[PDB]
Amino acid sequence: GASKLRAVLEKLKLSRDDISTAAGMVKGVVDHLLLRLKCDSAFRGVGLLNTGSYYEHVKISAPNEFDVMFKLEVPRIQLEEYSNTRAYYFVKFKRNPKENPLSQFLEGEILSASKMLSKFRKIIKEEINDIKDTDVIMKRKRGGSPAVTLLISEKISVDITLALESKSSWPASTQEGLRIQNWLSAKVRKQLRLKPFYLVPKHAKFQEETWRLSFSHIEKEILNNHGKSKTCCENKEEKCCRKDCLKLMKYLLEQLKERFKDKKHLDKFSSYHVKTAFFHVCTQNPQDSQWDRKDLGLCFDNCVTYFLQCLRTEKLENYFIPEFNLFSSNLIDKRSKEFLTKQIEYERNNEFPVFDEF
Ligand SMILES: [Zn+2]
């Protein structure tokens, strides 16, 4: 019941100070990398994007896995959607008056992601080896985003993502996304869509010089300012359980991944999937009275049941790009989704024995 869920949440709090100090090490390394990058003429105006709960810029997606985004203001953006994929784009430049600092990365009229990543990597691996003080290990990663994974000390690994910043209107593929009007209001949806959007070098399936839309800054804003009431969670009368439900869903997936590690059935699933499903459940349940702290058990069941539906139907829409299905067969194979469906179903039907202490 909810008492078991509350106990899980209390257990997770015991890790807080270890996370804070570990995020503190990520922070110091990143601050160092930022100042060196700014020396290169192409990465002049590089900066840290506000996406995380630690020091504005350090984000957790799983215990000991930290996430940091480097933003780069790139004016005159011009996007060309890569063949009906809705989330992947070629990057061109609207006009030519000044020759852009990223001229070096052009292959024709198109900004090369793999060219720009190579320099980004070269500069980082240059400073990572040019540090006597602390051993910091770079592992060139799977492809595109994240660009670099550093390994600090033993278990701390920070992913570092480069992101182009566009202050232009969001692409047409987002026009029916961010369906927050009945929850956070039409006024807020308008304000959020006036903010920049970001492009990360992720490559569509093998390769291409494509970039993927990213809204990590908006995700943080709507998790931290998450109520229909402006004063949700600002006083003792308005304590909702939205953040606790997302935490429990992330922990559920983390624990199942560890239990099913012998055959790695669940490798493709991520906290981003559970976060996306959670945002959809917020749209479905827009009133703060549907997230009363006393109803933690029912609220968590709402979240789990919707995630199960996404698995069984093999459909999880990106919250910002509705026609981008995170659970398509191109991204996650059918047998993986069928397998997780069965395990989530079992957990729900048995009151989550994966959360048992005995
Ligand atoms: Zn709240």
UniProtKB/Swiss-Prot annotation:
Changing residue 318 to H: Gains susceptibility to mouse-specific RU.521. A motif (KRKR-loop) lies at residues 139-142. The N-terminal disordered part (1-160) is phosphorylated by AURKB during the G2-M transition, blocking CGAS liquid phase separation and preventing activation. Phosphorylation at Tyr-55 by BLK promotes cytosolic retention. Localizes into the nucleus following dephosphorylation at Tyr-55. Phosphorylation at Ser-271 activates the nucleotidyltransferase activity. Dephosphorylation at Ser-271 by PPP6C impairs its ability to bind GTP, thereby inactivating it. Ubiquitinated at Lys-250 via 'Lys-48'-linked polyubiquitin chains, leading to its SQSTM1-mediated autophagic degradation. Interaction with TRIM14 promotes recruitment of USP14, leading to deubiquitinate Lys-250 and stabilize CGAS. Ubiquitinated at Lys-13 and Lys-220 by RNF185 via 'Lys-27'-linked polyubiquitination, promoting CGAS cyclic GMP-AMP synthase activity. Monoubiquitination at Lys-187 by TRIM56 promotes oligomerization and subsequent activation. Monoubiquitination by TRIM41 promotes CGAS activation. Changing residue 13 to E: Strongly reduces stimulation of interferon production. GO terms for molecular function: 2',3'-cyclic GMP-AMP synthase activity; ATP binding; chromatin binding; DNA binding; double-stranded DNA binding; GTP binding; metal ion binding; molecular condensate scaffold activity. Changing residue 220 to Q: Acetylation-mimetic mutant; reduced enzyme activity. There is a cross-link at residues 13, 125, 187, 220, 247, 250, 263-264, 315 (Glycyl lysine isopeptide (Lys-Gly) (interchain with G-Cter in ubiquitin)). Its main location: nucleus. Changing residue 195 to E: Does not affect interaction with nucleosomes. It catalyses: GTP + ATP = 2',3'-cGAMP + 2 diphosphate; GTP + ATP = pppGp(2'-5')A + diphosphate; pppGp(2'-5')A = 2',3'-cGAMP + diphosphate. The modification Phosphotyrosine is found at residue 55. Changing residue 14 to N: Strongly reduces enzyme activity and stimulation of interferon production. Signal peptide: none annotated. Changing residue 230 to E: Abolishes homodimerization and subsequent nucleotidyltransferase activity. Abolishes stimulation of interferon production. Does not affect subcellular location to the nucleus and cytosol. Changing residue 140 to E: Reduced nucleotidyltransferase activity. The modification N6-acetyllysine is found at residues 220, 228, 230, 250. Its EC number is 2.7.7.86. Changing residue 228 to Q: Acetylation-mimetic mutant; no effect. Changing residue 250 to R: Reduced enzyme activity. Decreased ubiquitination and SQSTM1-mediated autophagic degradation. Changing residue 145 to A: Enhanced stimulation of interferon production. Does not affect chromosome localization. This is Cyclic GMP-AMP synthase. The lineage of its organism: Eukaryota, Metazoa, Chordata, Craniata, Vertebrata. The gene is CGAS. The chain holds residues 161 to 522 of 522 of the full protein.
